[PDB]
């Protein structure tokens, strides 16, 4: 979910912390329902992709000597 500082920019208004929660509690209540395509493009406007870093170790190249 977008953070309060990102919601405060889509709206161009100042928000309280409880104002943010009430809006999020209302979106979750919208996912649990049988939301259609029209009700899914709207929720994705407020979903920000969280990039997960790969913890897999980088492998060194195998070289050959003389």
């Amino acid at each position: 979910w977008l953070i309060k500082e990102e919601l405060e920019e889509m709206l161009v208004e100042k928000l309280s912390d409880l104002d943010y929660m009430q809006f999020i509690r209302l979106l979750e209540k919208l996912l649990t329902s049988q939301c259609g395509a029209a009700e899914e493009e709207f929720v994705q406007r407020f979903r920000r992709s969280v990039t997960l870093e790969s913890k897999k170790q980088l492998i060194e190249p195998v070289q050959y000597d003389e």
């Binding site: 009430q22 509690r25 209302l26 209540k29």
Partner: protein, 86 residues
């Protein structure tokens, strides 16, 4: 002294469970007010002091019963929010 014995304040033990028999006896004497009575009687409470305590206990019971009734009445609306978002 003149009454029959082993009738008043007498509880029979079941299956050798003496702990449960004693707890039942203590609960009996507590509910009838004997335990509090015996304790208050160790030292003389003066009549002005007894009236003050009896008045305080009677007013506290009324206030506690009245506060329980209010919470019971006002807990009917503790159900989930019907108009969430509005």
């Amino acid at each position: 002294a003149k009454h029959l014995k082993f009738i008043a304040r007498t509880v029979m033990v079941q299956e050798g469970n003496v702990e449960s028999a004693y707890r039942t006896l203590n609960r009996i004497l507590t509910m009838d007010g004997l335990i509090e009575d015996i304790k208050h009687r160790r030292y003389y409470e003066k009549p002005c002091r007894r009236r003050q305590r009896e008045s305080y206990e009677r007013c506290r019971r009324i206030y506690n019963m009245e506060m329980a009734r209010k919470i019971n009445f006002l807990m009917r609306k503790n159900r989930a929010d019907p108009w969430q978002g509005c």
